[PDB]
Design a protein around this ligand. Sequence first.
Ligand code: SF4
Ligand code: SF4
Ligand code: SF4
Ligand code: SF4
Ligand code: SF4
Ligand code: SF4
Ligand code: SF4
Ligand code: SF4
Ligand code: FES
Ligand code: FES
Lengths: 571, 571
Amino acid sequence: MNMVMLTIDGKQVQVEKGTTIKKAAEKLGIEIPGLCDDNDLKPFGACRLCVVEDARGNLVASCHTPVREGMVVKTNSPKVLKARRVILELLLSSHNADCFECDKNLHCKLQKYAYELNIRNIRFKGEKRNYEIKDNGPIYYDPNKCILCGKCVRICEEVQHICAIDFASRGFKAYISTPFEKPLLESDCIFCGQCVRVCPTGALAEKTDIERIYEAISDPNKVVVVQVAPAVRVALGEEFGLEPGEIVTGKMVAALKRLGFDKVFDTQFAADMTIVEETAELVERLEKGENFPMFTSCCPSWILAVEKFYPELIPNISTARSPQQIFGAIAKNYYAKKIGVARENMFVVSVMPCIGKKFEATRPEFNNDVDAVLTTRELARMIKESGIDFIKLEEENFDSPLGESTGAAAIFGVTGGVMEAALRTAYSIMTGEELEGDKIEFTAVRGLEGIKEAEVDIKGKKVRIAIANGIGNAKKLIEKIKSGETKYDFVEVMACPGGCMSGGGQPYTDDPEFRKKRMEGIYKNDRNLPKRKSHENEEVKKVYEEYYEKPCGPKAHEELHTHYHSRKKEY
Amino acid sequence: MNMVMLTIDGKQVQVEKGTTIKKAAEKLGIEIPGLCDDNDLKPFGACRLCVVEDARGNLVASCHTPVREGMVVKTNSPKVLKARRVILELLLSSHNADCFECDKNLHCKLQKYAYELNIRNIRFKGEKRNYEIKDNGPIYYDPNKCILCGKCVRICEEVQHICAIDFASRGFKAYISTPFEKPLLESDCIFCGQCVRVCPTGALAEKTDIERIYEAISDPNKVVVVQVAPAVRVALGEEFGLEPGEIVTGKMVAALKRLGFDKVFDTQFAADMTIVEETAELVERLEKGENFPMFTSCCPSWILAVEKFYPELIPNISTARSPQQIFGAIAKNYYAKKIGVARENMFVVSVMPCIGKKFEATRPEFNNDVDAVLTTRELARMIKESGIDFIKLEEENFDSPLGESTGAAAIFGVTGGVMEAALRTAYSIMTGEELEGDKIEFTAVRGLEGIKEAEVDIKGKKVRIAIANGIGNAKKLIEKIKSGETKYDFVEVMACPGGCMSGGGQPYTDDPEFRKKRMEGIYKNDRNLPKRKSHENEEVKKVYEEYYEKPCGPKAHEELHTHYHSRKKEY
Ligand code: SF4
Ligand code: SF4
Ligand code: SF4
Ligand code: SF4
Ligand code: SF4
Ligand code: SF4
Ligand code: SF4
Ligand code: SF4
Ligand code: FES
Ligand code: FES
């Protein structure tokens, strides 16, 4: 091993060779500001705001200069501060200053740096950016506030391997867009929502359906039922000053009950129903031994990717609905006749951490089962708007008769958790017995690796299980499968890297290790529940024996399944 | 005690009769927004943003509504939210939106309420407020961001009884002004800074001089000494997310060392200098028995209030300088000859929590001993500017030979702690012995009462002592003295209510009970020290025996004394 000695602010530093000055100065109790840098991306050097001076007398960037042995650098010299002040004055000279009306208010990094570097009087006044905004679906793009940091194109090209947007024009009028300024829906985008999560300004944000929620609640002839996702309860607490990984289920239930919503349920019931349907389909397919491999259809971004780029995989993907639409069908068809409320007077609201769900809700194939879709940020805005203090609430429980949950549906917010639930139910449906002890947990499908392969043995029969997180890794698996190197049986894809815990709806964070904390939170949540199996739930059995009488029945085929059509129109 | 039964948002409430419907709902884990209300002021009802809905169906204000038996109210009805949204749109329609240049950025309450209530598109665009910025000294007034809440007028009317500013004009063009738009120096202001502390916008701020500090640092031939106030050690941590009242001495010393300052010192040394000099003066005045009562000179605002309103008490004021100017004279007179530097080439910077110090630094009669002054908020902004992480610093001590101190000089940030620091020294100098055990602490001069009185018996000799915090209580006690009811010996006055811990330079807080926490922090800091007596300090005695040889000497009269001249201009 090779170690490197250097001096920073007159202090001796030992660092491993090859790390940058920004990374090497983390343990020294100092932080260099920068806008174009992220922990998941390569250095770009477009902000030029992270400059520090070496011994010679010139300023160099600190995010892409490797540490060489025997240099002295300074961080609080007056020249560096002057350069940073002038650079932020230049940035702020052409920014439309409607900070009252910005969705990214109180979380914008540019605003924090404008406060932090003591800017009080901008001498450069003149031409401002003046473009026209247009709708794009669930993604609201305002090119008046862009600073051309390049994070969105880098996260859409280097990680996602999709290349949906890129730079355009030259000079002062350069701007990031699609080909020929077309809307994102008919472009090559798949609505993963990663570009929204990394934008340091308010250029990229979410279309809001807040007014429709308030008009629906204000109407005295409409009954409102609201569902929450499994992955919201672990990261909702970041807005209110708590560390990530805290379980706030009861507090959020109390907040939802006090917000005016008539009924509060959870997706975990529909999640268990989806698991039952998927494992029935898997058992049937394995008995016939046809259409290998079989893909899961629980991620709207994945199904958009299949419909847009790979139309040949349409026969091989499952026909099961998303859990959101499953709960919508249950609420509009079975619960409504039980309570005695007309279908035209029922409102269903969902809280999900994804952005693909916002587009998925308005697909004409689903007959408008879900009316409006929220995100975690919108729910956190409701709580502050209504004045509810989140810290000192009293925890309550979910309503009846479909609020009770199991431990199999509590790990959908982690990559491969659907696979653990599928193996948990498949072991019981094949072997006939129930796993007890450490055999309940499948540790072979846990972690944060890009590709997760497993050879699962059930009563002497071995099956192949493949998990891919990230669209690029899914493309790699597609290339390997079409190459015919090996054959799998049951393959999961989630477009967001790391699972739904890192979707576009989750609150913004600065810690570089939020994924590990959220995984620990979800797993500790799952370990704190008496029931760990999907089929052991009673209410799912009551719903089946009350209305459908059989999984994968003709009524279930009518309501619990859908068909996909290829969107890859030829040129 | 008579209790009242009611319901608020469907929850039963038990509260005493007489509380409003906003202050009696804070203990239900719910809080309704408001801008015109503060815990130290009578309700005024100018925001009209704290409205709720009663049973009848008309919107009623909450900050001035007494509660009676039998009301049902709701604070989350759609009508109330719509009214609040429209009212905030009306406010932000006429606000100059340069939130990058605003000194109150990331702490403005209007910004936070614009974020909370989900404002996205201002429909009412029209004529804005267009006034002209004028200079006033240490108070920077910008009547373009004023929302006419009236907090400054009420706090200069109800508490201070100074009557410096008042409303002017009518209609849309009304504003806050002095008579005839004269500068605040020539008006009846006394520069207490309370109006700065309560302003919920960026209208009233500080004239910030970080720039001059920066070319002072960048000059290679100038040597910089920075001094810190006793009341800063208990309030800086609130700027970094800590609980108020945490002792952060070592952390702020490390931060000041890393900021480029050549030498760092505490002003407790000069404070003990002032204590021993004032004790000598008090012993002298007791021996002659003339010019009673005698007033302290530790507060510049008190001196201004005397020079403007009560010019007949000038012969009765102590001639001792403030500790800041005494430390400046020591640094520019004794320390400079010891190190071997020219007097013009020494730069003295102070970090004090008061606002009147900014004006006091530039008096022509002090011969420009100090060059620039700061407050705690600017110190925190500099710390965050250089990138220093305050949480993970290492404790380090002061410099030499003016770094160490005693416990008598650490309680200046409390109403009463100055005379409590002088009674021990007077006891020691007149009796000849030193207090032991719990007799060091005097429990009769601690608390938060408006006027504190005590009769202290020392060796059979009784002295009458009085404390007045707040200029209103000072005026009351001056009226009592001029009435001739009782005779005093030694009177302390601090202009800000609650002592120097509630100055204008301290960080903004929303907790209603910050004064108790700050007092507890100060007392814990005092009790965590080995030496508790000003006389037992070593370097004070060394300085006298090397340069003065006697307190109240001709050299001390030349350098540690000043004279006051009346400012009451005849009309
Ligand atoms: S949503 Fe995903 S695919 Fe679409 S532009 Fe953003 S990063 Fe690229
Ligand atoms: S759109 Fe957002 S992420 Fe992309 S360059 Fe502009 S500011 Fe950066
Ligand atoms: S992007 Fe940031 S600085 Fe720009 S308007 Fe929005 S909040 Fe203000
Ligand atoms: S992984 Fe989850 S958050 Fe990401 S696109 Fe798929 S469903 Fe949405
Ligand atoms: S007072 Fe508040 S809202 Fe107005 S410009 Fe300053 S920070 Fe923005
Ligand atoms: S500084 Fe004090 S006296 Fe002067 S206007 Fe403000 S509150 Fe009134
Ligand atoms: S100057 Fe500040 S405190 Fe005074 S009325 Fe205007 S906004 Fe209110
Ligand atoms: S009491 Fe302290 S903070 Fe207030 S004006 Fe006097 S010296 Fe300044
Ligand atoms: S973000 Fe580091 S050089 Fe631009
Ligand atoms: S601000 Fe409370 S009633 Fe006006």
